[PDB]
């Protein structure tokens, strides 16, 4: 009977950085995905492992909403079988991904004339991320054989970098708020159904 708090995830005042993406489990509610369309035209509304015409006529054990902020030229990485700094080092989707990716422009909220600093992304990693893995480790990246001793320098780079979102950037470099809706099926009674049951 209760509606799923999808609006709370999309209407957050400040979104999380991609290296430290947020996650909320949606459970025991009616999932009417029309509530999210109060958020303007979407730059991307792509679903995988599921029929988009069935999004309001399906029951699942749980639904997961992962939210973060990337550049425009990086939204294509939030998809199964993709490469790049976001997919390799920040947020990785599995090949058998069952869900939808929803991205909209946030230049008017996530950019300042001086340059947004809190929105950061990981630039270096010794290995690619596993699907749905999260890396918040803040160690200096040792590119060579010489240890780094905890300070950046030659062949020793800080792993996290800021976007520096300014309003006068091109749309490819402007901030975009992404929400990844994950549909979970386990051998357990379903707690999230659509309005059409």
């Amino acid at each position, epitope marked *: 009977t209760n509606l799923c708090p999808f609006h709370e995830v999309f209407n957050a005042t400040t979104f999380a950085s991609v290296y430290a993406w947020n*996650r*909320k*489990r949606i*459970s025991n509610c009616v999932a009417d995905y029309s509530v999210i369309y109060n958020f303007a035209p979407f730059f991307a509304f792509k679903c995988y492992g599921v029929s988009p015409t069935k999004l309001n006529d399906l029951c699942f*054990t*749980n639904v*997961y909403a992962d939210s973060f902020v990337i550049r425009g030229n990086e939204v294509s990485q939030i998809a199964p079988g993709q490469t790049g700094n976001i997919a390799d080092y920040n947020y990785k989707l*599995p090949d058998d991904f069952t869900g939808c990716v929803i991205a909209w422009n946030s230049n008017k909220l996530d950019s300042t004339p001086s340059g947004n600093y809190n929105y950061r992304y990981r630039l270096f990693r010794k*290995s690619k991320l*596993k*699907p*749905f*893995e*999260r*890396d*918040i*480790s*803040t*160690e200096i990246y*040792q590119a060579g054989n010489k*240890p780094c001793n905890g300070v950046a320098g030659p062949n020793c780079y800080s792993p996290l970098q800021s976007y520096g979102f300014r309003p006068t950037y091109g749309v490819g470099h402007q901030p975009y708020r992404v929400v990844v809706l*994950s549909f*979970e099926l*386990l*051998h*357990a009674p379903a707690t999230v159904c659509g309005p059409k049951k």
Partner: antibody, heavy 127, light 112 residues
Framework: QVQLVQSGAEVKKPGASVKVSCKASGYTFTDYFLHWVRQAPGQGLEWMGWINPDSGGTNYAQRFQGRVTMTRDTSISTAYMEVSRLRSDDTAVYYC????????????????????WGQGTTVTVVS | QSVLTQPPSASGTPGQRVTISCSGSSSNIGSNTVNWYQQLPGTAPKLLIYSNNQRPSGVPDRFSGSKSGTSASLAISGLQSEDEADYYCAAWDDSLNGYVVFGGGTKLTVLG
């Protein structure tokens, strides 16, 4: 008070069974996985498995697959650990520890640590 | 199944910096994050480090974690008498169905 309180000490004979309780409070019981770690006297820590209290799914260590059953009771926010065919080698302190990553997906699990720990339940196997 | 190798013992005088190594393989430390625990006598383990170098809320900044290859290391700078305890490393091992591997533990003795 985010807390894990376990049942009292147990003394059993070899071959018998024991069921240890682990009650959670101060947080949503189904948000976090629960681990089971035991420690023989004077020995190190040994991982026994995790259980997802949201679904009941488990992942036992290979050494305990067959003699150990983990269950949940969301009604009273209590996790149970039952060991069958108790050996003298099972005499140890049994801990329940909370998985420190919220909202895990069972089929895409990632272990990052155990933040909340219970006081332990002593199990002594003597004849 | 796997074994994370720690030095059996380690010592240091008050105020010094002590390091405790944790040697694993490619399927545990080389593939996953490393977390560290402190265990006082007659006490349940306490999380000191997680996600390689992150400290939980309330863990003093004199504790430091690091990961490199298939090895990890815990550093206790500004050693105090209260730091005398057993210290464990742990990491997920991707082998088989997956399992948490605890190190053998290292007993820290604050001399002086």
């Amino acid at each position: 008070q985010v807390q894990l309180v376990q049942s009292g000490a147990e003394v059993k004979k070899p071959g018998a069974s024991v069921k240890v309780s682990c009650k959670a409070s101060g947080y949503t019981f189904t948000d976090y996985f629960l681990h089971w770690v035991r420690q023989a006297p004077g020995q190190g820590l040994e991982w026994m498995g995790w259980i997802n209290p949201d679904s009941g799914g488990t992942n036992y260590a290979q050494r305990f697959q067959g003699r150990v059953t983990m269950t949940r009771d969301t009604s009273i926010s209590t996790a149970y650990m039952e060991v069958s065919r108790l050996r003298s080698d099972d005499t140890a302190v049994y801990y329940c520890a909370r998985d420190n990553e919220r909202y895990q997906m069972q089929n895409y699990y990632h272990y990052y640590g155990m933040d909340v720990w219970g006081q332990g339940t002593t199990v002594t196997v003597v004849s | 199944q796997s074994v994370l190798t720690q030095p059996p013992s380690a010592s240091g005088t008050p105020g010094q910096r002590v390091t405790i190594s944790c040697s694993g393989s490619s399927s545990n430390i080389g593939s996953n994050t490393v977390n560290w625990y402190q265990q006082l006598p007659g006490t349940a383990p306490k999380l000191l480090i997680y996600s390689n170098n992150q400290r939980p809320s309330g863990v003093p900044d004199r504790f430091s974690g690091s990961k490199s290859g298939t090895s990890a290391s815990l550093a206790i700078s500004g050693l105090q008498s209260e730091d005398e305890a057993d210290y464990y490393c742990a990491a997920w091992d991707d082998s088989l169905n997956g399992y948490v591997v605890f190190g053998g533990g290292t007993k820290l003795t604050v001399l002086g």
